[PDB]
Design goal:
Radius of gyration of chain A: 21 Å
CATH class of the largest domain in chain A: Alpha Beta
Bound molecules: the ligand C[C@]1(c2nc3cccc(C(N)=O)c3[nH]2)CCCN1
Strand content of chain A: 15-25%
Number of strands of chain A: 11
Oligomer: part of a larger assembly
Organism of A, B, C, D, E: Homo sapiens
Keywords: Protein-inhibitor Complex, ADP-ribosylation, DNA damage, DNA repair, DNA-binding, Glycosyltransferase, Metal-binding, NAD, Nucleus, Phosphorylation, Polymorphism, Transferase, Zinc, Zinc-finger
Entry title: PARP complexed with A861695
PDB class: transferase
Number of domains of chain A: 2
CATH topology of the largest domain in chain A: Phosphoenolpyruvate Carboxykinase, domain 3
Largest interface: A-C, 29 and 29 residues
Chains A, B, C, D, E: Poly [ADP-ribose] polymerase 1
Structural class of chain A: alpha+beta
Helix content of chain A: 25-40%
CATH architecture of the largest domain in chain A: Alpha-Beta Complex
Largest sheet of chain A: 5 strands, antiparallel
C-alpha cells in the first residue's frame, strides 16, 4: 500500500476526482450525453476560444446582429449545452464572453486532468494513489501544524481575512510544501531580481492537476482579452480574501484549495484602473493594481529575502481606485515559484 | 402557439427543466450512469427512507458498529453515489441522516416531476408548453407589477429582509396568483377558523412541479423524524429571510421560487425549543416556534381576514429561544391555501 | 437693489467668490506671488496639459529618467508651486499625472470664472449681483421646499445615500431649477432618443461659473487620458454618494454644489472594467460602467419619459466588477440637459 | 364597577403599585425593616439633600477626610442602607453624590405616591380604581391605535430610535392623551411664545403618580447641582432614544412609561458643553444642548404651531460637542404642557 | 551638508514650512494682501483675544445687539478676513467665539514660527537645515523601527485606534525621541509625584515649531474660557483616536504630527461633565474627564514608573458621561515632559 502520508493521499483523490469533473460540467449546463468527459479536446477548446474572441470583436464593432446569432450558434455547436427550451442564450456582450471564457479555461484543465488520469499503464502493480501522484511531477510534503512555516501561513490567512465580506470564515485543514519538477532551476535566474513576495493564488479544485503538472500558465493568443484587467498574465493577491473567491466553494462543497507562490516581481508598474498592456514599460517587470485595502505595512515580514505581507487589512493611501484589493501580475511564468498549497475549509455565516 | 402569457411560459420551462433535475442529482454525487432520472422509483425512495430511520435508531441506541456499516452499505446500494475512492461516508449521526433525508425529499419531487413530464400523450397537436401547464392542475395568473397585491407583497419581501444575514438582496421578477385544482373547496371549512395568516414557504426549484401538482405534503411515516424541529408537518415563516434560505440559490443560479400561502392557524401552541409532537394539545391547531426576531406588530395589516405580518424585523419579547425566526407548523394539509408564487432574483453581496 | 430671490443671490456669491478661487490655488501649493489669479491663461493651461501627456507617454515607455526630470521641471516652471525645500515632486507615474490633470481642470474653470467676473462694464448702474447673474447665461429659479419636484429630489438624495461610506450625512439647503441659454434647443434632437435618465454630477464649487456659463465639457485633446476610466466624456452617477465625492467638501467647508441632469443615454454599452474607447460600437450611444451597488429597480420612477432611479441602494447582479457604483458616460455634450442644481450641507460623522 | 377603559385601569394599577415602590427601595439597598415605605418623610429627604450638597462642597474643597467620613455616616443614618459587611461606601466624589441625589429624587416621588395612595377616605363606596384615578387630578383618555395622533407619535418613536444603541427595540402598547388639572390655564401665556416643540421626557415608572399629580418639577435649592448638566431645570429630548434611557426598564420589567410634552422654548441659548446657569441671557428662554445626532430637519412637521421633530436621526453640523443627543431645558414649569403618555414595551436584543 | 539624519531633516522642513503657514491662514479666509505672515503681531493677537472674551460676555448677558455688531466689526478690523459679499459673519454665540479663539491660538504659533524662521543670522555659513533645527532648542533623535520603544508605541497607536470613528487608518512613518532644552530639570521635582502616565497630545502641524521651542503652554488670561471643557490647562488623551482629531489632517494632506508626553498626574479629580475650575481641590493635582470608552486596564503596562495604557478600547464603567474618551488636564506646565513625536500617515476609508 502507498507509503504516502494520509493527508497527501486525500489531496490526490481530491484533484483527480472524476465525479468532480462531471459536476463542474453539469454546473455549466453542458450535456454529458453529447459531450462526455473523455470527449473533451484541446483543439476543440482552442476553436471555442477563437469564436469567443470573434464575438468580442463583433460586440466592439456593434455587429448588425445575424453575425452575432451565427457566432452564438457556432459556439453552442462546439460546446453542447442542454437548455431544453427558451433557446440558447445570445453572446452579445462583454459580460457574456467573460463567463464563457472562464468556462473554457476550467474545461481545459479538466481535459488535462482526465488525460493524465488515463495514461502510462492502467495496471495494478502499484495502487492508483502512487501512480496518479507521480503523474503530477510535483514533490508534495505535509507541513506539521505546530511548525514555524505553519504559524506564519495561518497568521497570513487569519489577518488578510476580514469582516467586510465575511460571508464565511477560513480554517486551514492541511498545509503542503511543494516543488514541482522544473520549478527548481527555471526560477534561479529571476531569483537574482529584487522585490520577491509570497502571494496568494486561488483556483477551482478541478484545475489543480493541471496546475501542479503544468504550472500556472498565461492565456493563449486565441483567448479573448476581456476578463483580464491587466492583460494575459498570472495574477496574485496579497490578501487571502481576494484569492479565496476564485476557489468557488459553497455550503455544498465548503472545501477548497489555494496556492502560495514566491513571485519575483522586480520593479512594479503601478496602476489604479484596468489597463491592457502585456507590453510593459522599460525597467518594469510586473504590474501592481492598487487597491483600496492593503495589509498593514508595519506588520510586513521576511525570510531569505521573500517578503510576506501578512499585516492585517487597513485602508491604503489611495481610494480613487476601482480595485478593492491589491493585485499583482507577471507576464513570464519563470517569475513564479509555487511553494505551498493549502486545503481550506470555508464556513459560511449565512 | 401557446396563448399563455410570456412570464407564465417561462415559469413552466423552469419547473419542468430536465437539466435542472440532472444537476440536482449530480450535486448529490449521485451516479447518473447507474441511476438515471427515468430510473427513480417511489418504492425505492420509501425503502431508502426506512433505512435512514433505522440508522437514526441505531444512532440513538448507540449500535456497536457493524450494524451501522451494513445499514450504510445498504443505503448506498439503493442510492448509487459515485465517490471514486476514500470509500462511502458512514451514516453514524443525526447530522448525516438529516442530509440524506433532505435529499430523498428532493429526489421524490424530481421523480414526481419526471413522471408528469412523461404522460398522457407526447404528441405535438399542442405545444409542450400548454400541455405541461395543464399537468400542474393549477390555474396560474400574472399579477401586474403596479397593482395593490404586488405592492403589499413587495413590501412584505422588502421589510422582512434585513441586514443581519444580508449575504444577498432580493428582487421580485415575477408575481403569480395561484389556485390549484382541489385547493378551492378543501379549505372552505378551515376558513371558519380564526388566526389565518399569509406566510412564506421556500423550496428548491426542482420541487415545484410536485408542489403545484400535489400541494404541500407532510413527510411519510417511514421518514426519519430528525430534521423536523416540531414533528412532521408543513412549515411556514413570517420573515422572507427564513424561507428564502430553503430555495438553495447561488451566484451560479441566483434565481429561485417562493410561495405565499394562507394558513388557517387557529389557536397556536407556542414553543421556544424543538419539540416532536404532532399530537397537539386540545384546542390548539398549530404550533408557533418563537423566534428572537419578529415583524413589527404595529405594522401588521389585513384583508378579508387574513393577517399579513409585513412589519420590519424587530427584536421580539423573548430571546431565551434557540430559534432566530418565527416558524409556524400545521399538521393538516387542508389548513393550507397556496395563493401566490414569486420568482425571485438573489443578488449576493459577497 | 436686486429683484432676485435671496437664495439665488447667495448662490451667485458662492460661485463668483474670489477668496474661494485663491484658496483652491493655495490648496494646490501654487505660489500666488508668482502666479496670481489674474495671471492664469488658457494657452498656459493647454501647454501644461501637453506636458502632462508627455509625462504619461514617458511613463508608459519607461523613459530612462532625465527626460522625466526635464518634463517635471518644465511643468513646475509653467505652474509655479512653492515647496520651499525637499525639491519639487517628480512626475513619474500615472497617479502623479492624474492629480496634476485634475488640478489643471479646476484651474481652467477658475480662470474662466475670473475672466467672467471681469468683463462688460464694471460700473455700478446695477448692483454686482444682477450683473454677475446675467454673465452665467443661465435662468435660475428656486424650487419651493414643499413641492412635488423637491419631494422627488430629496428622496433621490436620501435613498441613494447609504451607510457604507457614511462619513457624513446629506442635507438639502436649496434646490434650483435651471435652464442655461443654449441648452433648450440643442437637446431637442436627442430627446427623440430613448433611455433618458435624470442623473447626478458633482463638482468643485469653484467650477460652477464655468459649468453654468459653458455647460459640461469634454476634456480637450492635449489632455492626458489617464484618469478617465472610459475615455474623455461626461460622467454621471445614479447614486448621489458617487457624485457627492467630487464636490470635495470638508468639515471646514461642509457646503457643496451638485447637479442633476437629464441625459439621453440611448443604447448603453455595458462594461465592468475601465476601457478607453470614445469610439463606441454601432448602435450604442453611451457607456454604463456596471457597479456592485445599484438603486432598487422596483423603486424606479418616471415623468415625461425621464427615468429617475431613486430606489434605495441594493447589491446588483454582478460583483465581478471593480466599480462600486454605476457610472454613465456620453461623448456628445448635446446629449445632456442640465435641469437642477442643489446646494448641499455635508455633516461629517467623524 | 369602574367605567374607565381597561387600558387606563391598567395604567392606574401600574403607577400606584406598592410592590414596585418596595422593589425600587430594595434595589437601592435600603433596609425596609428600618425604613418602611410609610416611614418616608419629605423633611427627611430635604435633610438628606442638604448632606449631599455638603459632601459636594467637601469634595470641591478637598476636605481633609474625617469631615467626609462624618458626612457619609450622617447620610446613612438618615437613609438606612443595609450592607452587612465591607462597611458603608464613602461619598467622596461627584460620581457618588450624583447617584445618591438621583435616588433621593426617586424616593421623594415614591413618598408622594404613597401619601396619595392613603388619603381622603379608604372606604369601598367606590372601587380603588376610580378613587386613585381621581387623586391624580389628571384627565386621561386612550388614543385609538388607528388615528392621526397615534400615527404621528409612533413614527416619532420609530424614527428617533436607531441602531447605534439598539440594545432593544421599542413597541408602543398604549397611547394616552393627558391634561392635568392646572395645566390648561397656566400655559396659555407662554403659548404666546414662539418655538413650541413636542418633546420627550422619560422617567421611572414609580415617579408617575407624583408627576401626574404635581407636574414636572425643578430640583429644590437644598439639592446638589452635580448631575444637572445645565442647572436645575426641566429636561427634554427630541430623540426617543435619549429619554427612554431614563425609564430604567430591563429584561425583568421591560415595560416603561414616557411622556411627550409641549414646551414653549422661545429663544434658545445654544451650548455644546455642560454649563450651570439658570441665570439665562436676556432674550433667551431656554437652553439647547447641541448633540452630535439630530432628527432630520427636512422631515420636521407641525400642527397648531407645535413643531414635531420626527425626522430620522442624522449627524448634526457640529460634533465638537460632548453631547450625543440634543437636550432642551426650561427653568419655568409654566413653559411645559404635558400632552401624552406612552406605555412602552422594551424588547432587548442582548 | 547637514549631518542630521534624513528623517529629522524632513521633520524640520515640515514644521518650518512657509507655504503651510500661508495655507492655514487662507483656510481661515484671512486676506494675506492686508495681513501678510510677516505682519502678524503678538499684541495684535492678545487684543483679538480680549475682543473675543468681550463677545462671550455680551453673549452671556444677552447684549441688546449693536454692542455685538461693534465688537464683531472690531474683531474683523484686527483680523482682516476677506469675504467679498454677504458681509462678515456675526459673532453672537459660544460656537462662534470658540472657532475664532481656536484660530487665534493657531495664528499665534504661526507667528512664533515665522519669528524664529527669521532671526540670528540669515547667512549661509551653515545650511538652513541645521540652523532652523538649532532654533527649536530641542534635541531630536530617530527611534529605530525595530526597537522596543517603537514596538510599544506602535501597539499604543494600533490598539487605541478602533472602528467606531474609522474614517481613516493610522500608519506610523517616523518616531522621534525628544527632549527640549529646559524640559530636563524642571520636571525632576514633579517626578517625585505618583501616577505618571504617557499620554497623547495632537496638534496642527503649523504649531510644532512653537510647541518644540516653547513647550506646551496654557491659554493666556485674555483668552475666552469657552472651548476648554475643564478650564485653561494642558490636555491629553489615553486613546490616540481622541488626540489624532486635533491634527486636522485630510485627504489633501494626510500627514500629521502627534506628541506623546509623560505627565505627572498625581491625584486626579474625576469628573463626567464640563467644569471650569483651574482652582483644584486640596490634594488633587490634575483632572480626569471620564469617558464612555477606555483602554483595557488589564493590558496596562509600565516602565521606570510611567504607566502606558495601551489596552484596546473597551466600554468603561460609567456611560452617564457626555465624554466619549478619557481626557487628562494639568494646570502646571512643569507637570509635563514631552518624550516622543510621531509623524503619522492618515489613510481615509471614505
Ligand atoms: C479574474 C482573474 C484573476 N484576477 C485575480 C486577482 C488576484 C488573485 C487571483 C487569483 N486567481 O488568485 C486572480 N484571478 C484574471 C486572471 C484569471 N482570473
Ligand atoms: C427544515 C424544514 C423547514 N423549516 C422551516 C421553517 C420556516 C420555513 C420553511 C420553509 N420551507 O419555507 C421551513 N422548512 C423542516 C420541514 C422541511 N424543511
Ligand atoms: C473621475 C471623473 C468622474 N467619474 C465619475 C463618475 C460618476 C460621477 C462623476 C461626477 N463628476 O459626478 C464622475 N467624475 C472622470 C471624469 C471627471 N472626473
Ligand atoms: C440626567 C437628567 C436628564 N437629562 C436629560 C436629557 C434629556 C431627557 C431627559 C429625560 N428625563 O427625559 C433627561 N434627564 C438631568 C435632569 C434629570 N435627569
Ligand atoms: C479642545 C482642546 C483639547 N481637548 C483635548 C482632549 C484630549 C486631547 C487633546 C489634544 N490636543 O491632544 C485635546 N485638546 C481643549 C484644549 C485645547 N484643545
Amino acid at each position: 500500500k502507498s507509503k504516502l502520508p494520509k493527508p497527501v493521499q486525500d489531496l490526490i483523490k481530491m484533484i483527480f476526482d472524476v465525479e468532480s469533473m462531471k459536476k463542474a460540467m453539469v454546473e455549466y449546463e453542458i450535456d454529458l450525453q453529447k459531450m462526455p468527459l473523455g470527449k473533451l479536446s484541446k483543439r476543440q477548446i482552442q476553436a471555442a476560444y477563437s469564436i469567443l474572441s470573434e464575438v468580442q470583436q463583433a460586440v466592439s464593432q456593434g455587429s448588425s446582429d445575424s453575425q452575432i446569432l451565427d457566432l452564438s450558434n457556432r459556439f453552442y455547436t462546439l460546446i453542447p449545452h442542454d437548455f431544453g427550451m427558451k433557446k440558447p442564450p445570445l453572446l452579445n456582450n462583454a459580460d457574456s464572453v467573460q463567463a464563457k471564457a472562464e468556462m473554457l479555461d476550467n474545461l481545459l484543465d479538466i481535459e488535462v486532468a482526465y488525460s493524465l488520469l488515463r495514461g502510462g499503464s492502467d495496471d495494478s502493480s502499484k495502487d492508483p494513489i502512487d501512480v496518479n501522484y507521480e503523474k503530477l511531477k510535483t514533490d508534495i510534503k505535509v507541513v506539521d501544524r505546530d511548525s514555524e512555516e505553519a504559524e506564519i501561513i495561518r497568521k497570513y490567512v487569519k489577518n488578510t481575512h476580514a469582516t467586510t465580506h465575511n460571508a464565511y470564515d477560513l480554517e486551514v485543514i492541511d498545509i503542503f510544501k511543494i516543488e514541482r519538477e522544473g520549478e527548481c532551476q527555471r526560477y534561479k535566474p529571476f531569483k537574482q531580481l529584487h522585490n520577491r513576495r509570497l502571494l496568494w493564488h486561488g483556483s477551482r479544485t478541478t484545475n489543480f492537476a493541471g496546475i501542479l503538472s503544468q504550472g500556472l500558465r498565461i492565456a493563449p493568443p486565441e483567448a479573448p482579452v476581456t476578463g483580464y484587467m491587466f492583460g494575459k498574465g498570472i495574477y496574485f493577491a496579497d490578501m487571502v480574501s481576494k484569492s479565496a473567491n476564485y476557489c468557488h466553494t459553497s455550503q455544498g462543497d465548503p472545501i477548497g484549495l489555494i496556492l502560495l507562490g514566491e513571485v519575483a516581481l522586480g520593479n512594479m508598474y503601478e496602476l489604479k484602473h484596468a489597463s491592457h498592456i502585456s507590453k510593459l514599460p522599460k525597467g518594469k517587470h510586473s504590474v501592481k493594481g492598487l487597491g483600496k485595502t492593503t495589509p498593514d505595512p508595519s506588520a510586513n515580514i521576511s525570510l531569505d529575502g521573500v517578503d510576506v505581507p501578512l499585516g492585517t487589512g487597513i485602508s491604503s493611501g489611495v481610494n480613487d481606485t476601482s480595485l478593492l484589493y491589491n493585485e499583482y501580475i507577471v507576464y513570464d511564468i519563470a517569475q513564479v515559484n509555487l511553494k505551498y498549497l493549502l486545503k481550506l475549509k470555508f464556513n459560511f455565516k449565512t
